[PDB]
């Protein structure tokens, strides 16, 4: 993936999931998403960045892009008497956008899309009735023959 | 306007950089740290010093492993590990050291140090 | 047709 | 090569258990050190490769620094008539000292120090039967409510 | 020289100065070992780095290869809840294994070896009856051709 550091640290017992390559997800503010791949359902958990609201986060799907579009506003403060700071490093943006292309393979279903907000994290449980065929190769032709028990 | 304008005339020494916002409202010391997706509020300890009279917070956001409900393809995952918030309060005796309350809600940890 | 979601609340802890 | 998990595992192929922590540390001139922490009693083990009698080691408490005076010497095998000094290698540490720095708050005991000698291992337990300088001892009060069961 | 160990090594001139022969039997966990060579006994002090155990360390002789074998584990610390590691660095390898090719001449009888552990050091004394004939030569030969001083 990367030259050294971020290729090897992707396995279990301290952070990450296996991550060879990757395609860009257009967004403001970069925060990971877990994809639980199944053919009976599909998971999208978008870690919302400590937003106290959740009713100002609009979740919608483009059937014109095949992408899940979630937008929201990151908390911000304005200089006031009853606000007085000693330290500040709060975010670096006041608005957050994620544009997510699903690598779920042709057979997408999201028009039945349902959402939940759990633990300060937006979780979208995406119904799937497809694909069971017609992925990369039209009608799956996975290894099922070897002319023996496994071949030797 | 995502942080705010604040000239440096105060500062409390600290290690590890995470999004923070010290807030002083009435007479309390309050801090908003971005810690979302932390399962249980007992994975973050909020310890108030009885030998310094100061707040001290540490936490850890659960770390992603290799999963049997996820097929690994090209999907990134990340979290922040162990971290410590070293906040010093030169607020002096006259502050209640037994009435500190922390409010972890919506992925936002809100602290209150009364000073009733 | 454009679809929207509006799932919110559940602010009682878990 | 840089798996923080395997880095810590490689550290823990030298002691075979769970996880480390951080406390103290200032020292000048390296000697064997094993810093293990109980409830508030702290443990120090300095390996000796055998020593002639137990009168070659002194244990006291620094009354002017709030430190612990641990000092010893292990004699060298010398004037051997059994076999000439032309083959074999022997090394035994000379005059070593250990300066133990504890920023552990007032309530340390300087008379209840116990040093145990057995199996050629220096065993040191420093009480610490009172961590706090406050009236309540061993008490740090934490969060008790948050108006939600966890947070979401 | 300038190092303490080096000037100590130079101070082992008690009938000749001691410096490395140019060989040393396999070592895991660097700790020296002492041999005293004789044909009436062979005295071997395996310097042990402070093992708490004394039933888990094994001593065996191989009469087929004529190698004395001593091996065991270094007992490492644990992290539990009344054991909380900070930093430690003893027990660099958990397994130590001692093979020695005896340079005490053939005729050694190490089936009469005695083992005892005390002070933090393993002490092994191998009593000898042979060598005294049928050792390196069958009935020893000493050159007695000498004198003839009167000029020529």
Numbering used by the authors:
A (entry chain I), D (entry chain B), E (entry chain A): 63 to 214
B (entry chain J): 76 to 191
C (entry chain X): 201 to 214
Q: What text comes from the article?
A:
Hsp26 is a small heat shock protein (sHsp) from S. cerevisiae. Its chaperone activity is activated by oligomer dissociation at heat shock temperatures. Hsp26 contains 9 phosphorylation sites in different structural elements. Our analysis of phospho-mimetic mutations shows that phosphorylation activates Hsp26 at permissive temperatures.
Compared to the previous analysis, the new structure revealed that the predominant species of Hsp26 is an oligomer comprising 40 monomers arranged in a raspberry-like shape both for the recombinantly produced proteins and the authentic protein from yeast. We could resolve the structure of the ACD, the CTR, and parts of the MD. Our pseudo-atomic model of Hsp26 consists of residues 63–214 (71% of the sequence). Our structural analysis revealed that the ACDs in Hsp26 adopt the non-metazoan association mode, as the loop containing the β6 sheet can be clearly seen in the density maps and fitting of the wheat ACD domain was possible. These dimers are the principal building blocks of the 40mer. Surprisingly, a β-strand of the MD extends the β-sheet of the ACD and then a helix leads further into the core of the structure. Thus, the MD is intimately connected to the ACD and three MDs associate with each other. While the CTRs exhibit some flexibility, their density is always visible even in asymmetric reconstructions indicating that the IEV motif is predominantly bound to the β4/β8 grove of the adjacent dimer. Based on the 3D structure and the crosslinking data, we suggest an auto-inhibitory locked state in the inactive oligomer where the MD is locked to the loop between the β5 and the β7 strand of the ACD.
